[PDB]
């Protein structure tokens, strides 16, 4: 059952329509929620370069931060709009102040590994990721790049373990995003267990780090709290969410929508 959740999360898709910025037929693809725009759009680039970081993407006038996972961008920015997601493709006037350059897939690999290392520092003080052989780091990357669930999780499983005498990771890797992508996200140190060893819930996390999301009168959700396009109950244990609903980068990226 829980393994089924890992698979369902891994194979999440956003149907997307790419239209070339005016200054060419629109192009349609199922994009993996868990990956990155600049990693999965070779076909788009191929399609449009036949009529003319450098390519960049835009939603309703706002440049899309490719280093945020696709599913997170969609949930935060477009989940209230009808599918397919309408993205505009640009090849000129790169927004130098707004977007990180992405000159090659190596840049994406570096960002991804950087996120994984920060997550393991939070979870295990880097012990797991540092004890792996270098080729294991490569296998994690190639698992994502080639959309190979088995290949990725043969290694990722190790990052989801924790000591026998514990009931979860040291701290949970999460980031909470509100309204837009340019607003800094919320990220704090938060332990998955309480001082008495009880498991903290999603509600506990929000009460502590984003209480504006909670109705003070009854303690229930006030805003929409979205993870991978679904809305877990507040009483969902945080450790379980970290193990099963994290992105490949080992983070729980969470959208708050008014």
């Amino acid at each position: 059952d829980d393994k089924d959740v890992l698979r369902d999360v891994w194979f999440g898709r956003i149907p997307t329509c790419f239209t070339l910025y005016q200054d060419a037929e629109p192009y349609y693809l199922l994009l993996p929620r868990v990956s990155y725009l600049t990693l999965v759009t070779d076909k788009v680039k191929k399609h449009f370069q036949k009529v003319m970081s450098e390519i960049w993407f835009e939603y309703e006038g706002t440049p899309l931060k490719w280093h945020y996972p696709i599913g997170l961008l969609f949930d935060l920015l477009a989940s209230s709009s009808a599918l397919p997601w309408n993205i505009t493709v640009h090849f000129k006037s790169f927004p130098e102040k707004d977007l990180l350059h992405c000159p090659s897939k190596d840049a994406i690999e570096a960002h991804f590994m950087s996120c994984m290392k920060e997550a393991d520092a939070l979870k295990h003080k880097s012990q797991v990721i540092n004890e792996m052989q270098k080729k294991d780091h490569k296998q994690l990357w190639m698992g994502l790049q080639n959309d190979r669930f088995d290949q990725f999780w043969a290694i990722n499983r190790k990052l989801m373990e924790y000591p026998a005498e514990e009931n979860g990771f040291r701290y949970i890797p999460f980031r909470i995003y509100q309204t837009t992508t340019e607003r800094p996200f919320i990220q704090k140190l938060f332990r998955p267990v309480a001082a008495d060893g009880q498991l903290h819930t999603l509600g506990d996390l929000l009460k502590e780090v984003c209480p504006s999301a909670i109705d003070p009168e009854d303690g229930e959700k006030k805003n929409q709290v979205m993870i991978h396009g679904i809305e877990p109950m507040l009483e969902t244990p945080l450790q379980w969410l970290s193990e099963h609903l994290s992105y490949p980068d080992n983070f729980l990226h969470i959208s708050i929508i008014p």
Partner: protein
């Protein structure tokens, strides 16, 4: 007996698959 939160995860994922794929299985995969 299964926790309510767990049942919700499975039901919402079932719904998401229908929402994000029902009208779109004719789209090409970005990664194949």
């Amino acid at each position: 007996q299964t926790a309510a939160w767990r049942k919700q995860i499975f039901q919402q994922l079932t719904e998401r698959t229908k929402r994000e794929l029902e009208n779109f299985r004719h789209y090409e995969q970005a990664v194949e």
